[PDB]
Amino acid sequence: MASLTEIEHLVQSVCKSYRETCQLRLEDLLRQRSNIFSREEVTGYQRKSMWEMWERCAHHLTEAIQYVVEFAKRLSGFMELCQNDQIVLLKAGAMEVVLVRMCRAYNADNRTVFFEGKYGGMELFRALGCSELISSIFDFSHSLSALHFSEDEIALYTALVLINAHRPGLQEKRKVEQLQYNLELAFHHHLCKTHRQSILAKLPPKGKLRSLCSQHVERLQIFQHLHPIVVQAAFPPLYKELFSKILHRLLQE
Ligand SMILES: O=C(O)[C@H]1CC[C@H](C(=O)N2CC[C@@]3(S(=O)(=O)c4ccc(F)cc4)c4ccc(OCc5c(F)cccc5Cl)cc4CC[C@@H]23)CC1
């Protein structure tokens, strides 16, 4: 049950929820493309301490995940599932949603990402000691650039990243399956109607997004083992919660 109106109405409320919950405006990100970090500024970032860079990136990651919580809270029928399923979906999905959202701050053209006010390439994150991880993040953004996503496509796709009935630990598995289906119908209908069905074959596999979150938790478990007090005192609580009950607080406001 759902007609060609109830499926279409979902499309526009998904695009709306997404529009209203992005950390950065795409128009803004596009106009700052020529504001690039100097050779001296890149060298300043490389000279910064690993733990300083870690705290900066973790703070920025937390900043973005907070907007993913607001996207989830406005997503049709997400607030109607149980609190345990809301956390299950956000714990597993929020990072992946930022991993897709991230492509809007990318520029395949110059291979740079927007960070702390200006655009900069992979070598801006050398201090982190995440040679392969930052590389994967950059390649993942490069691959999504090739798809030339519309904002409405990013909205429907990210909503499907978050609404995954296959996430382990889901209590009302069928209530999440029912929701995932309507969003899939809304996405594929919008792709059909816009003559953009050809993207389906080119969307990244399920494992591309899964290995990225896993690599993040692996390098984090390494950094935390060498600087445990740095993570306790300077890392954000919601960051430590997601990768190391703030989510329950966010889910009420
Ligand atoms: O408008 C929006 O909502 C979007 C605006 C743009 C936002 C965005 O680009 N981002 C939100 C924060 C940022 S970043 O700008 O700090 C950045 C960092 C590394 C990059 F390769 C590129 C960018 C980020 C932060 C941490 C991270 O992994 C976890 C992590 C740590 F935490 C700490 C150390 C190491 C790691 Cl690996 C990965 C990414 C990728 C997406 C990036 C995404 C949301």
From Swiss-Prot:
Residue ranges the record marks as coiled coil: none
Induction statement: Up-regulated in the state of obesity.
Q: Where is the NR LBD domain?
A: 6-244
What is said about the domains?
The AF-2 (activation function-2) motif is required for recruiting coregulators containing LXXLL motifs such as NCOA1 and NCOA2.
Entry's disease: Immunodeficiency 42: An autosomal recessive primary immunodeficiency characterized by increased susceptibility to concomitant candidiasis and mycobacteriosis. Candidiasis is characterized by persistent and/or recurrent infections of the skin, nails and mucous membranes caused by organisms of the genus Candida. Mycobacteriosis is characterized by infections caused by moderately virulent mycobacterial species, such as Bacillus Calmette-Guerin (BCG) vaccine, environmental non-tuberculous mycobacteria, and by the more virulent Mycobacterium tuberculosis.
Q: What does this protein do?
A: Nuclear receptor that binds DNA as a monomer to ROR response elements (RORE) containing a single core motif half-site 5'-AGGTCA-3' preceded by a short A-T-rich sequence. Key regulator of cellular differentiation, immunity, peripheral circadian rhythm as well as lipid, steroid, xenobiotics and glucose metabolism. Considered to have intrinsic transcriptional activity, have some natural ligands like oxysterols that act as agonists (25-hydroxycholesterol) or inverse agonists (7-oxygenated sterols), enhancing or repressing the transcriptional activity, respectively.
Name this protein carries in UniProt? Nuclear receptor ROR-gamma
What species was this sequence derived from? Homo sapiens
